[PDB]
Specification:
part of a larger assembly; binds nicotinamide-adenine-dinucleotide; alpha/beta; 384 residues; 4 chains; 10 strands; binds manganese (II) ion; 6-stranded parallel sheet
Chain lengths: 384, 384, 384, 384
């Protein structure tokens, strides 16, 4: 059979200032009091208070829960669920990067299906649709405000538990590039290379569609041109807005086409060592592309053109090669770490990271199907 | 402002056999009785009955309403609404092309808001969302199963009214290429060329964004390869599936970018003479493009590349002209009327047609702003 | 000798909202009362009351003189001059197109040089800096807010006279594209093609310089991309902003390199028939460029490429030919009159018109030097 | 806001012999005793006397202050201010290079505004326009007869302070290539590469406009053809005239677009070690361009073609790198030192150099925003 499906929230706001609608949009759902899920950093910057003011003007109450953590944890879910129940909230607003979107998605699911966030690992292992949720995005790399994914760390197993589930698609998303201006360069760089990774893995996924293809291609072309600008000058407003679009394009593509062994492996490093997700993808992306080359050489040749390379006079193989050269050059230019050893990864952990990566759902749509020793080789190469 | 927004059903099913889900999807919404809106043609072929038994086996009842006409009228909508109440319905399933979809959306909207369908001509007039509706698409050209559009003919004024309303986005859409094999050639061509007009007008709209751009580009490239194949052999399954993707992409593109004076004028020629919608687009498209050229010359030149033209060693202006020639050649190859006069249009109407087009919501995003006299000359050219 | 000079106001303001500075700016110049020289149309639209309040909110007094007529006249100058004294003003603020700039420069010059504006036809014949004057520009074509020219129609010999004096350089110019949005399409086209004429005549003028060359090349390139956009949709702010820049590059270039026989002839048609200055240049431009060709063949070839033409594999001669085809095509697409006879030009005037063109200052820098029979033929070709 | 402004002296004279107008132009101002600010070498040449003879031959009194030193000091400005009051001058005439123009500008401004020159470091500090000033320019590189910059060394801090102030735009400029023929090759090279640094940083500046782009592009093209010629044979009169146009095109460009980190860092190496400003720029230029590359890669690719490189079949990035190789090549050919250590800079000073560089007003328009650590890496690269 050849069926496929496309999912995203039914209303999706973009552009400078769109965050000011969160109040009146929340009232429109007839919710009374929302739990505002965010993280400590943005709470300290005061972003949680600016948004909470907007929501309360519209007559909707806020309880602020700034305890979601980079690489959100099952404990954050349990703790925020308690604060959801304790403060009599009927909705969730998320405010931040993908960590706040996924914390809030877990809380909103479990507040309507009951057990623990581990009940629902895998694919549509759920029952009811999650409680009303508006996702306000502030990094330019995840797309989690658009996706049916929620990535939650299992703290006793050391593994980022991918939860794929139609019930966690947000009600409404908001993508306001004015809230992204204050990303430091290194956060700009890594979330941006997470978007690029989404776009490239979605383009080469076995679950790719002409719709997801259309989005992924646009995302790669934009990122290629505007991500190094946004990193060099976070106050370049044009680059911020373009990255906000690219982020959403890549999120819509991967949500519906699937990822690959870049995310499969990056999820394990993130669980063992709590690395930044986006840095893990940037480090890994060239090695997985290299391994995948022979299964998708024409698509990698086209990525090489998307990334601005000149492929005139070359074989398809040689043009695919230039896509990897260009990814490497972009990583070096954005000051991405050279490998995982210098960050703290452990030689003795490589086989368990490999084995766990082959269990990740993101591995299912990788165009090349590896054996365990090949996955190990990819992690070894990324140690450099 | 520079704000914008992207709208779409939350869930959109694709691929061979995806109609089998309509009963259980309907059931999950908790509705008890659906009014099945289709047209006499599909009803005669018995498609109407296969779908009803699928819905019934899931516990939802069905009342069939096979009285949506090509270019659905206000009278169709009023009759549908009294069927809807008489048969104690709480939901709507539309089955067929864009006449079924729009008829059903209009019934659904009036059921939720009172008044009459005429009251909602314009942009975001209604207070309440339409009642639950699932759209099953049997043509490869409208995208109405995805859009906040519904086109209802005011029969006193002979105007196909454009109702553009967030509140008429279907709950869920189904796009089954197996239901599309039966289109005879001239229907394949007319709806395909409606899709190409969606993609072209979206691409040159002043409401274009990089998201809508991505979708429109892919639609044009796919249509240019596969539409002539679908017209040539309706049982070419790969062309049917590609066109089902192309028409969805173009739907998403125009739904969020806007249309232009092709649709604003076609709606008057359709309101006056009941011509097929995609035949009106096909006749007008080269004239409105030629007229729009100076405002979007670089985008028309790119469009010539997407359609396969060779623009080597040409000015942008000369390249854009090859795009009009390519559109003209495609129309001629699929047997479109070269003009309207041979179809029965009357010179004395032209002033009224032109004045009605300037009130259509699609005029709002056309990239060149015309004086009434310029609209008049465009129609007069389209006569011959 | 090979000396040369570059003149312009010492401060020039650009960008949206820059008009809000005219008041504070004026007061910092230490003046009390400004005679606001505008024309009837912009006074009818309320503009000279937006400006007038701004100048008053900064504690400076305004006396609106809305009597400058298209193709300003020795009478407007005299009547504005006596308005100047009677009302006890010490400064001029021009607001409008070239007509309002030129009226205010004439009033301000003769307000510090006693006599009558006739007393300064020619070159630098004034003997005193003109009264302090701030020029607020609202069309995109004459760059008079930058220049040392004022063109006053001698209602006598019916010839637009030239007072080329360094004393008429405005004190400070303001160039706010928001004020330009109101221009209707045909005013946008004609001021735009006058800007393009400025840029081309400056580029082929025997008075050219590497500096004027740099400005003219940019103006030609910008106008070629954005003037058709500005005509097609006056609400395209980007195209409005680019045209404001092109306007000033062309002004700065021709003000310091000189013009040629396009303006030399067009000044005669404007004195005899009061035709719009911009339209005169538009019709004349391709015929003079044809005549000028053999004196400047490489530079017209370069203009062809600035205007978008592809010139690979062409002789310099053939490339220079495409500059003229492209200028004609652009005149056709902006609905410029095809010749002067349909405007009201009389066969019996061609001799006087040509003899008078030969006495125009602008004739002096034209690269080809015509005998009287040759000017007469140019005027015949532009009658069609 | 998109607001911008273009500043420039109202009258600017060019060409051989133009310096013969200085007296009549100083007379037209109505001033009586001008302080003639020059340096020791031009004084001993006889240029101070020749010019004073012209100023006196038409009724104005001259008093020669020949004490401006390369990299003018706060003490020079103090001493020259005491001379200004001693002889009780009402004006100033600067004669020579940037050292003389900035000495005079600083004197004129403190004369008009009060305290000491250190008060006005930064942007638009002062309250009053400086006293009348005519700049006669004798090097082909500063453009400071045109600009609102004056660069005065704080001798305690060893900081060449950038005073960027509308109020120091000279009343009139004279740019006479006959006074430039005597530049010895090393000085021709250094002033020429300073002007190249002005065009390049103006072109990549975040303050660039279409106007400044026009000027800067022309400068680059002319410098790359004629600067090598002027160095190879200073009696080449054509190269001398071209270089006089390019230095002014570059002055107009950076004056209004802004500079970057080449000048921010150069100002500290000149303040600490009193190196010639142009040699400092030439050393830093490749390092800062390569740092800036990712933020302005399209524009650095254009710069490569402007400098004559062939870029066919190259990515934008590889094209941009060719620009840097061409920049390094020109410096090598004109005998500029490879680094700052052979000149006498010391590693122990680098931390203080970088911190002060970040306080320089020229840093604000650099297209990439550095951390202190990145400014330190640039200075270290430049030591070798
Ligand atoms: N479910 C999905 O669709 C999906 C997809 C990709 C990644 N993820 C998950 O998302 C997480 C990564 O999220 P992320 O990379 O967006 O970052 P994040 O949410 O982990 O945030 C990291 C840091 O960035 C800061 N920050 C965020 N926005 C900021 C702004 N505008 N200005 C200043 N600081 C700001 C936060 O305060 C925080 O300290 C991982 O857990 C990853 O697994 C989910
Ligand atoms: N709301 C929107 O987004 C939107 C967009 C474009 C057009 N429209 C409207 O849609 C209408 C046109 O719809 P359409 O062109 O899809 O056709 P349609 O709904 O008017 O149907 C045309 C004919 O085709 C037949 N048909 C449909 N599917 C068939 C199949 N699979 N096999 C055989 N016969 C089949 C029908 O029985 C009918 O007789 C117009 O009224 C137009 O204005 C709406
Ligand atoms: N440097 C110079 O001195 C110089 C150069 C070229 C031409 N000119 C002279 O300038 C005049 C040409 O002026 P012009 O072509 O700019 O037009 P204009 O000043 O003659 O005005 C033309 C018409 O346009 C209207 N208008 C102007 N700005 C408008 C706006 N923003 N919105 C709506 N309507 C607007 C005016 O009300 C008027 O009715 C002629 O006299 C010509 O000879 C002078
Ligand atoms: N816009 C600005 O304000 C601006 C821009 C760039 C540089 N500057 C400053 O200008 C200064 C550098 O000025 P410069 O490089 O023009 O030189 P300079 O004024 O420092 O003169 C250097 C030496 O060249 C000699 N010289 C000058 N002209 C000569 C000629 N025609 N023939 C023979 N010898 C001649 C002088 O006598 C002097 O000894 C620096 O302090 C720099 O910071 C200012
Ligand atoms: Mn990711
Ligand atoms: Mn349509
Ligand atoms: Mn003109
Ligand atoms: Mn400098």
């Amino acid at each position: 059979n050849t069926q496929s499906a496309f999912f995203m929230p039914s209303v999706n706001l973009f552009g400078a200032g769109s965050v000011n609608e969160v109040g009146t949009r929340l009232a429109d759902l007839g919710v009374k009091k929302a739990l505002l899920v965010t993280d400590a950093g943005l709470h300290g910057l005061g972003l949680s208070e600016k948004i909470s003011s907007i929501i309360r003007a519209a007559g909707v109450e806020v309880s602020i829960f700034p305890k979601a953590e980079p690489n959100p944890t099952d404990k954050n879910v349990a703790e925020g669920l308690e604060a959801y129940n304790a403060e009599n909230c009927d909705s969730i607003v998320t405010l931040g990067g993908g960590s706040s979107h996924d914390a809030g998605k877990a809380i909103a699911l479990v507040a309507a299906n009951g057990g623990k966030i581990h009940d629902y690992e895998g694919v549509d292992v759920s029952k009811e649709p999650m409680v009303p949720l508006i996702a306000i995005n502030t990094t330019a790399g995840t797309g989690s405000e658009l996706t049916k994914f929620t990535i939650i760390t299992d703290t006793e197993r050391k593994v980022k538990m991918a939860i794929v589930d139609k019930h966690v698609t947000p009600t409404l998303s908001i993508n306001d590039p004015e809230l992204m201006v204050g990303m430091p360069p290194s956060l700009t760089a890594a979330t941006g290379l997470d978007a690029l990774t989404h776009a490239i893995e979605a383009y080469v996924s076995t679950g790719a569609t002409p719709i997801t293809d259309a989005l992924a291609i646009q995302a790669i072309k934009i990122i290629s041109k505007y991500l190094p600008r946004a990193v060099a000058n976070g106050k370049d407003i044009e680059a911020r807005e373009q990255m906000a679009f690219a982020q959403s394009l890549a999120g819509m593509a991967f949500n519906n086409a699937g990822l690959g062994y870049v995310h499969a492996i990056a999820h394990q490093l993130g669980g063992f060592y709590n690395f930044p997700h986006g840095v893990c993808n940037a480090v890994l992306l060239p090695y997985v592309c290299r391994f995948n080359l022979i299964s998708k050489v024409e698509r990698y040749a086209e990525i090489a053109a998307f990334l601005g390379e000149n492929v005139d006079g070359l074989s398809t193989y040689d043009a695919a090669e230039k896509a990897i050269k260009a990814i490497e050059r972009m990583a070096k230019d954005l000051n991405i770490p050279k490998g995982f050893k210098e960050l703290g990864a452990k030689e003795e952990d490589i086989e368990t990271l490999a084995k766990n990566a082959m269990k990740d759902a993101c591995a299912l749509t990788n165009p090349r199907k590896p054996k365990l020793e090949e996955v190990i080789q990819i992690i070894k190469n990324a140690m450099l």
